[PDB]
């Protein structure tokens, strides 16, 4: 899941980004700042990206000062990153809670939609059961009336057939 990016002709103003050493819970070298319009911005580096290799130097367990030395060691930098690996290190508490709220709201919106759709279908099935029993009773009443009507007509036909 690593991406490899290339920066050429690093000038005196430099990359236009900052690196920070991760804390104990999230160790590593992370991009903490990116200036708009900088070389790092033009090549797509973003705050929160983790740098895992630069110019063949492994950025795992590397201390801060050495990582800086490598990134200042050449005018051409090949930087391997895991994008957004440390994004939460540079998020405010409110931004992280807002994200958690939004994810919960999306699940809750679907749960409520399905709950009410299910309830409407329960009611609909109850209505079908009532109406089908009512119409079954109407049909059986009509059937037994017709059986009697047939016998009553046959009785009249017996009178009709007296000549």
């Amino acid at each position: 899941k690593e991406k490899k990016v290339f920066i050429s002709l690093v000038g005196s103003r430099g990359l236009g980004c900052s690196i920070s050493s991760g804390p104990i819970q999230k160790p590593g070298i992370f991009i903490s700042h990116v200036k708009p319009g900088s070389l790092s911005a033009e090549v797509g580096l973003e705050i929160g990206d983790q740098i895992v290799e630069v110019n063949g130097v492994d950025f795992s367990n590397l201390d801060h000062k050495e990582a800086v030395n490598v990134l200042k060691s050449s005018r051409s930098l090949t930087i391997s990153i895991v994008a957004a690996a440390g994004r939460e290190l540079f998020m405010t508490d409110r931004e992280r809670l807002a994200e958690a709220r939004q994810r919960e709201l999306q699940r809750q919106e679907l749960l409520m939609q399905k709950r009410l759709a299910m309830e409407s279908n329960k009611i609909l099935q109850e209505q079908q059961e009532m109406e089908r029993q009512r119409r079954k009773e109407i049909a059986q009443k009509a059937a037994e009336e017709n059986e009697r009507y047939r016998k009553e007509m046959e009785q009249i036909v017996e009178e009709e057939e007296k000549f």
Binding site: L15, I19, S20
Partner: peptide
């Protein structure tokens, strides 16, 4: 704050 260097 984290140990930070601008490049």
């Amino acid at each position: 704050g984290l140990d930070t260097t601008d490049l």
